[PDB]
Structure formats: structure tokens, C-alpha cells
């Protein structure tokens, strides 16, 4: 499979309006070599996909969110499933590719009583500790602390890309407006200002949190080249016997 192969089918894979979902497995198949993908835990924690694939003949670990199941939210099972795979891939010198489409963590009293904080910290630790090269592509959205849990640029990430339909925000637009403009008594002009000011990849691109805004059709050729230059990545960290993962 040629490294510079284009994928025009991904230019409209993400629906233009938010409430509709799509299949991230389609994107994963379109991006990787020969559309071959060995999925790990395909029937458990369906809201996240982890697996092994190849880019330009080199094995890579693929981690992504699933908007089809649970609207892409993160929970205990998905956090553990992603964390173990990320830890293994980092331990055995396997590059990581991440596809981010997450609205946050799944709410409810069942998640709080189960220790959702511990498992979210597990996933965040797994992504933060990783030394192997990491490439991240934000497809549709990344809201709140989940955006940090999904290997953001500030977790010593190597390369971050955002599709033109992406948006990075602190929280939902309606919630942010109602929590910031309580004393203004405006829900129409302020809502429009927020929608066409911060519901877009431009705040992050201006802040430098994403290296570029790339057309989806060029994502594969955009990734392989990166994996060419990051093969010699080497970092140093303070000495320790072993760290204390929040298990």
C-alpha cells in the first residue's frame, strides 16, 4: 500500500450536524495499510476501539473513540481497555495513533460508585507515560478533561492534527453560556457569539495546541511521513524503580 495514497472517502465521513453518529472503524480501515486491522476486545467496551494495524509496513497501535456506542463517551471499561493496550504498546516500542471524538465522560451514579475517577486516571496515566511516538487526529470533538485524557499536545505528544469539522472546547456551548452569562440575561446574541467564536478548531490552532488543520483525504499521507521522522525519538525521564499507577 503506497504511503502517499489518498483517501477522498473520508472528506464527508463525519456528518455536518452534531447529533448524528458515524463509524470510526471505517476511518481506521481507510487509513491503515491494505485496510487490515486486528481488533482487540471487539465485543467489550464498544465505545472505544483498540487494535493493531500497519502503516507503510510498520506495526502501529490504533486507539479511537466510537460515536456509535454511548455517543463516544468514556467509562470504566473503556478506560481500562484503552489503558492496558496503550501501556503494552509503549512498553514494546509500538507507535500509537489516536482518533479523538469524545463529548466527555459518561455520567450517572453507577459510574461514580464504581470508581470512574480511578479508571480515567488510569487512561490519562497510560497516555501521559508513553514514550513511543504518538500521532493524534481530532475528528469531530474533544470536550473537557477527556480532551486531555486522549493524548493532547501537552502530554508530551509528538504530532496533533484536527479535521476541519473538529472543535475543542472546555464544555458544551449551552452549558458554558449558561454558566458564564448568568448576569447578562442574554441567551440569543451571546449564544451566537459563542457558537461562531469558540465552536471551531481556531482557538486551539491559534494557541498552537494542534500543529495543522488538515483535509481528511490527506490524513494517511499526513501520518506515514510523521512516522518516518519519529522513528528515532528518544526522551529522558527522572530515575525511579517504578511509578505508582492509580490502579
Amino acid at each position: 500500500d503506497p504511503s502517499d495514497r489518498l483517501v477522498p472517502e473520508l472528506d464527508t465521513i463525519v456528518p455536518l450536524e452534531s447529533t448524528k453518529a458515524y463509524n470510526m472503524v471505517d476511518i481506521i480501515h481507510s487509513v491503515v495499510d491494505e485496510r487490515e486491522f486486528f481488533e482487540i476486545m471487539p465485543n467489550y467496551a464498544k465505545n472505544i476501539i483498540v487494535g493493531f494495524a500497519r502503516m507503510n509496513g510498520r506495526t502501529v497501535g490504533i486507539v479511537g473513540n466510537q460515536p456509535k456506542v454511548a455517543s463516544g463517551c468514556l467509562d470504566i471499561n473503556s478506560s481500562v481497555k484503552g489503558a492496558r493496550f496503550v501501556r503494552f504498546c509503549d512498553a514494546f516500542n509500538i507507535p500509537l495513533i489516536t482518533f479523538v471524538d469524545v463529548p466527555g465522560f459518561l455520567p450517572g451514579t453507577a459510574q461514580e460508585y464504581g470508581g470512574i475517577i480511578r479508571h480515567g486516571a488510569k487512561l490519562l496515566y497510560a497516555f501521559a507515560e508513553a514514550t513511543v511516538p504518538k500521532v493524534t487526529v481530532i475528528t469531530r470533538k474533544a470536550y473537557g478533561g477527556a480532551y486531555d485524557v486522549m493524548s493532547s499536545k501537552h502530554l508530551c505528544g509528538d504530532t496533533n492534527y484536527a479535521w476541519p469539522t473538529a472543535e475543542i472546547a472546555v464544555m458544551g456551548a449551552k452549558g458554558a453560556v449558561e454558566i458564564i452569562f448568568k448576569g447578562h440575561e442574554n441567551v440569543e446574541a451571546a449564544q451566537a457569539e459563542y457558537i461562531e467564536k469558540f465552536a471551531n478548531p481556531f482557538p486551539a490552532a491559534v494557541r498552537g495546541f494542534v500543529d495543522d488543520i488538515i483535509q481528511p483525504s490527506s490524513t494517511r499521507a499526513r501520518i506515514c511521513c510523521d512516522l518516518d521522522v519519529l522513528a528515532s525519538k528518544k526522551v529522558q525521564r527522572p530515575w525511579r524503580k517504578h511509578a505508582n499507577i492509580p490502579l
Partner: protein
């Protein structure tokens, strides 16, 4: 494509699909700004991104997008549109659209209102043909309202009987009756069908004709009274009364009959005062007795096949005559310059009722533009989706050549190199009908698809040599993948010791038969022994390209590897048909015998959804002991209504097909007992 003469400066096309792309391309040839309309779903179509400017005309459904006429006038008055082109279907033949366009300064590219009124219903067209020395199908003239009168009329006109409702049409309301009791049966069932569909109840009884070869003549006229006939087209091969394979030069007819048909058609066009481009359809029997079927006052979907033999662009002529320029060609200029055959690739499943429409996105899409004598008209692209709101149209594939055989060879080559991944197409059906023996010979009829496949389409019945070739290709592909799996980079710490396998022994399971295969590799050539028969397969063995070109015993073949699995399963497109094989090692095959089969809980008594769509009618109830052949429910999907029956007698346990609901493929809704 001379731009010296004065020509319109802005044209707004009022149609979607491949015809929109074709008309936009033709307009761009003459340096004309082109405006396009689209729904919300089709905002990312190829035609909107190819046109100069695109306007939304409402939501996704056709009723509020391409039938919202007021939206069309609003878009036109917003864009300063000089002209308008409706393509085919939709609003192409609407009198109200024509009068609304005539109210404004905009000009309608096509026939005037008078032609639409004349050809709207079969009664007026039939009487106009009768008074314009036109042969017509024999039978009573006028609307029949009494069942007894209908059966009597059937008695005088003849034993075969056909009932077709006035106006409407488009593949519905046509029934066949044989006896007088069957005549009245058809009478009241057609009355009920007309009431349900349109409510006109203007059904007409006529003398049915057997083996009605469907031929047509392309007529082109201008405002100055000059009219010409553009040779002919042959469109007999149909299912559900829609054409899928059609050919311009009809091999059945000869020169004198073609000239007579052309003169008669131009006389009819002069009588009706047709000043645009249109089609007139005839039903020729086995004795060359021509009969007027219908005249379409719109551009035909199979117009590309007749515009290549004549070597002209028809849309340019249509625009020129819409402007008012005189025709620049005469009847002596119309000449045949070879052969042309073309097929309609749909998004259907040919194994279900000769094509059951299906939905989905296009993961991969590639057309064989580089093959010689190939022309593709498609309104889709990689990433396009097929919804349940529009026709399951994929593409039109046209091949032109010197004669019939070479054109058919090019056509088969074109199907062999056509890549569609994401939806289910009917490429296998087209391949079978274009490689059929009688089709090659020429003996074809309207019911060709029905009587060649009495039990429905089954796929390519590959012969012994073709089976051996397919087995050899599959085994060579398996061995090539296994060999590629052993090519790692140099490690310098743990050197790789490549295995030395002289011969691969495989047990290939195809259909319900196990074949012993011995494969050997010598560079790029594979020697394969299948049950003692020797074959040589040579190829570049590129395992990433969707299309693989191989040579087996000196014969070139094109293969698409649809799927492969580590367990041994492999789906391969051979000769346009997808075959599933199971390739296993001899040791693995012999060890598989000691292993239990998994029980499947689908032993009949299961009524899932054959296609995704909206349920419109339910004929089942929990506890109903319906017999075989009873319709479980009726599903509407993108301009087709299907009522699947019951394969066995049983008592319904639970009904999950609640009325007014959308169900995907395989949605279990009835479980009989």
C-alpha cells in the same frame, strides 16, 4: 463546440445525479455559467462542486426538494437564471412547471406545453397517431368502464389481453390477462391498483403481443419545423419494466426498415409539432410488424449510446434549439459509425427479484477510464452515499467499437475493471446478460431476463476449465500472501531463518466440494496442480491494489479480492461474480475433521427484513397461521414497493414490524411456527 455564436450566459439545471453532471459538463464546454440546485443531503455531491454556484432547495426528500416548484422559482429569481434544464424525470414533463417558467422571462430547454399535453395520456396520443397515419397496437379506442364490456372487447380484439392505466405509467399499472374470467380479474384488480396509486381509473384494454422487442427512435426538432431522426436504439432487456442493458444499432432491423421508421417518426414529430429532442418507442414483433408504444417528451437516460454512433453531442443541439437556432444537420448527415452498447449499474442485489435496492456509503470507487472505448456517466464519487430517497442509480457504462463483438468485448473488460466497495451492485447480472449465448447471437426479447432465469438470478455457472482457473488463482493468492508474511526487515540481533517449503498442499473448499491443490513458486510464476491438472499463473502479485491482472495458461484474467481471513475464508470476484472459498493447509484440513460444527438457530420460521426501508402495510398478526406465499408486509424503499411472501405455513408468534417504521436489512420482524 464553437463559441463564436451568441449563447446563453447562465443556465440552472433542475435535476440531480449523473445527468446533472453531464449537462453541467456540456454547458462548461460552451463557456456557459452553470447554476445547480440540491437538497441538504446532496450538498457534497459531485455536480454541486463542479457547477459554478449551488443553491439549497429544501430538505432531503424529493417532495420538498425537487418537487418544491416554488423553491425552484425562488432559486431562479435569486440567481438571475437565463434558462433552465430539467434533465429527465422529476419536473421534466410537468405542464404547471412549463407555464410557470413561461410566465417569467426564463426559457424552458425542452418541448413546449402543447407536446406535454398531447403525450400526457395514452388516449390522446393514440388518437393523434391514428389521425397522423401512424400504426398502433390494435384494440378498442376509449376508456372502458364495465367489466362485461371489457371481456367482450377482449373477445373481439383477441385472446391475449393487456390492461394499462391511462397516463401515469413508469412501470406500474400494466397487467396481463388471458381468458375472459382472467380479463375481468385484471379489470377489477387494475381498477383497484389505479385507485390506490393515482385514482384516475382510466385503464385501457388492448391486444397483447408476444415477444415485443422494444426499439426506439431519437427525434430532434427546432422551432423552424425541421426535424431529424437519430438512427435507433434497442432496449428490450428489462426487469420490472426498467431497462438495464441497451444498444443503439438494433441488429434485428435492416436499412430499409430503419429508414421507414425514421421517416414515420419524423412525420409523427411534424404532426405533433415537436420542436425539441425526444424519443418515440415501438414494439417490433418477430415478423417486423411495428407498433407505436409511446413517445417521451424528455431526454432519455440511454441518450449517450445513440450520440456516439452519430458522433455528435445532443445536449448542445438541445440548447441551440432552445435558443432558436436552426438545425445545422440534415437527414443525409445522420450516419452510423460503428456500434455502441451500454449498461446501467445500479445499487441493487441481483439475487433478490433481479435486483433488490440496497443502501450504504462508497468505501472504494474506481472507474475504468483508461480502458479503450469506455465512457462513464456517474453522479457519484468515493465517499458518496446511497439513501432511501432517490433512485438507486450508480452509473452508466458505455462502450463503442467497430462492430458488435468487439464492443461487447470492451464492455466485458470494462465490467472486469470496475471497482465498487461499500454497496451491493448488479455487475454480475450485466456480465451474464452480455456474455449470454443468445444475446451474442441476437435472439432477444422483452421477457429475456424472465425466461432465461425462471427461478431468479443465481450467478455465473462457471465451467470445469474456469473452475480450475479460479482454484489456481485462489491458491496462488494464498501462497503469495503467506510468502509476503515472511518478509521482515533485517534485525542484526535475531536473524530470520526463512522456511523452505518446496510445495504447498492445500484443501480448497468451494461450494460443497473439496479440491486437493499443490502449489509451487518459481520467482513470479506459480505452478498449480488441481486434481492432476497443471496450470501456470503469472502476475506481478501486488497484494494492495484492488484489481489484480493475472495470466493463466496464456489467458489474461482480472481478479478482485473482496475479502480474506486468517481462518481461510476468501471472497474473490471472478468473471464478475463473487465466490467464497475456504483455503486450508492439508494438515489443518485433516485436523478440522475432529471438530464439532456450531449449531445455528435459523432453521427457517424466520422473517427478517430483506432490504432496509419503511413499512407501509402489515398483513400479519401474532397467532395467525398464514400459509406459504402470503405477504408478510410491504416495504417501501427509494421508489420501489416490495411485498415479501412466506416460504412455509406457520403460526406467527410475535410481530415486530409496527406500521410506519424504518427497518434495516436483516431486522427480524416475524417468527412463524
Amino acid at each position: 463546440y464553437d463559441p463564436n455564436e451568441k449563447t446563453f450566459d447562465k443556465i440552472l439545471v433542475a435535476n440531480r445525479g449523473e445527468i446533472a453532471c453531464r449537462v453541467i459538463r456540456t454547458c462548461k464546454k460552451m463557456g456557459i455559467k452553470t447554476v445547480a440546485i440540491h437538497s441538504d443531503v446532496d450538498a457534497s455531491s459531485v455536480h454541486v462542486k463542479m457547477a459554478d454556484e449551488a443553491v439549497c432547495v429544501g430538505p432531503a426528500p424529493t417532495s420538498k426538494s425537487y418537487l418544491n416548484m416554488d423553491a425552484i422559482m425562488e432559486a431562479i429569481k435569486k440567481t438571475r437564471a437565463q434558462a433552465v434544464h430539467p434533465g429527465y424525470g422529476f419536473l421534466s414533463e410537468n405542464k404547471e412547471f412549463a407555464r410557470c417558467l413561461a410566465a417569467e422571462d426564463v426559457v424552458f430547454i425542452g418541448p413546449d406545453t402543447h407536446a406535454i399535453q398531447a403525450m400526457g395520456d395514452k388516449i390522446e396520443s393514440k388518437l393523434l397517431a391514428k389521425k397522423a397515419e401512424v400504426n398502433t397496437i390494435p384494440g378498442f379506442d376509449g376508456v372502458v368502464k364495465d367489466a362485461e364490456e371489457a371481456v367482450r372487447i377482449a373477445r373481439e380484439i383477441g385472446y391475449p389481453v393487456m390492461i394499462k392505466a391511462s397516463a401515469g405509467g413508469g412501470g406500474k399499472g400494466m397487467r396481463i390477462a388471458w381468458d375472459d374470467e382472467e380479463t375481468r380479474d385484471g379489470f377489477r384488480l387494475s381498477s383497484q391498483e389505479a385507485a390506490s396509486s393515482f385514482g384516475d381509473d382510466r385503464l385501457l384494454i388492448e391486444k397483447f403481443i408476444d415477444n415485443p422487442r422494444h426499439i426506439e427512435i431519437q427525434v430532434l426538432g427546432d422551432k423552424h419545423g425541421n426535424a431529424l431522426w437519430l438512427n435507433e436504439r434497442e432496449c428490450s432487456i428489462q426487469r420490472r419494466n426498467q431497462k438495464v442493458v441497451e444498444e443503439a444499432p438494433s441488429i434485428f432491423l435492416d436499412a430499409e426498415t430503419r429508414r421507414a421508421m425514421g421517416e414515420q417518426a419524423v412525420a409523427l414529430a411534424r404532426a405533433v409539432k415537436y420542436s425539441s429532442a425526444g424519443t418515440v418507442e415501438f414494439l417490433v414483433d418477430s415478423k417486423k410488424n411495428f407498433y407505436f408504444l409511446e413517445m417521451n417528451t424528455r431526454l432519455q437516460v440511454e441518450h449517450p449510446v445513440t450520440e456516439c454512433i452519430t458522433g455528435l453531442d445532443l445536449v448542445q443541439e438541445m440548447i441551440r434549439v432552445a435558443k432558436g437556432y436552426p438545425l445545422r444537420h440534415k437527414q443525409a448527415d445522420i450516419r452510423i459509425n460503428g456500434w455502441a452498447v451500454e449498461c446501467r449499474v445500479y445499487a441493487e442485489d441481483p439475487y433478490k427479484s433481479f435486483g433488490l435496492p440496497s443502501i450504504g456509503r462508497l468505501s472504494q470507487y474506481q472507474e475504468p477510464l483508461h480502458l479503450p472505448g469506455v465512457r462513464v456517466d456517474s453522479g457519484i464519487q468515493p465517499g458518496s452515499d446511497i439513501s432511501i430517497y432517490y433512485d438507486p442509480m450508480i452509473s452508466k457504462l458505455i462502450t463503442y467499437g467497430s462492430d458488435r463483438t468487439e464492443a461487447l468485448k470492451r464492455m466485458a473488460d470494462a465490467l472486469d475493471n470496475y471497482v465498487i466497495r461499500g454497496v451491493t451492485h448488479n455487475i454480475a447480472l450485466l456480465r451474464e446478460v452480455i456474455i449470454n449465448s443468445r444475446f451474442v447471437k441476437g435472439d432477444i426479447s422483452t421477457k429475456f431476463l424472465s425466461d432465461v432465469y425462471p427461478d431468479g438470478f443465481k450467478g455465473h455457472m462457471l465451467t470445469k476449465s474456469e473452475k480450475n482457473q479460479l482454484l489456481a488463482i485462489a491458491s496462488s493468492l494464498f501462497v503469495a500472501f503467506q510468502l509476503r508474511a515472511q518478509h521482515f526487515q533485517e534485525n542484526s540481533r535475531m536473524p530470520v531463518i526463512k522456511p523452505d517449503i518446496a510445495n504447498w498442499e492445500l484443501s480448497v473448499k468451494l461450494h460443497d466440494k473439496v479440491h486437493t491443490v499443490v502449489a509451487s513458486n518459481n520467482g513470479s510464476v506459480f505452478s498449480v496442480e488441481v486434481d492432476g491438472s497443471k496450470l501456470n499463473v503469472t502476475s506481478t502479485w501486488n497484494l494492495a491494489s484492488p484489481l489484480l491482472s493475472v495470466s493463466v495458461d496464456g489467458t489474461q484474467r482480472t481478479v478482485q479480492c473482496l475479502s480474506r481471513e486468517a481462518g481461510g475464508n476468501m471472497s474473490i470476484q471472478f468473471l464478475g461474480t463473487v465466490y467464497k472459498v475456504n483455503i486450508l493447509t492439508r494438515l489443518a484440513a485433516e485436523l478440522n475433521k475432529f471438530m464439532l460444527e456450531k449449531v445455528t438457530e435459523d432453521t427457517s420460521s424466520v422473517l427478517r427484513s430483506p432490504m432496509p426501508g419503511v413499512v407501509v402495510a402489515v398483513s400479519v398478526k401474532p397467532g395467525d397461521a398464514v400459509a406459504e406465499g402470503q405477504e408478510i408486509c410491504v416495504i417501501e424503499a427509494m421508489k420501489m414497493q416490495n411485498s415479501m411472501t412466506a416460504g412455509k405455513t406457520g403460526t406467527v408468534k410475535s410481530v415486530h414490524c409496527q406500521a410506519g417504521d424504518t427497518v434495516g436489512e436483516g431486522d427480524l420482524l416475524v417468527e412463524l411456527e
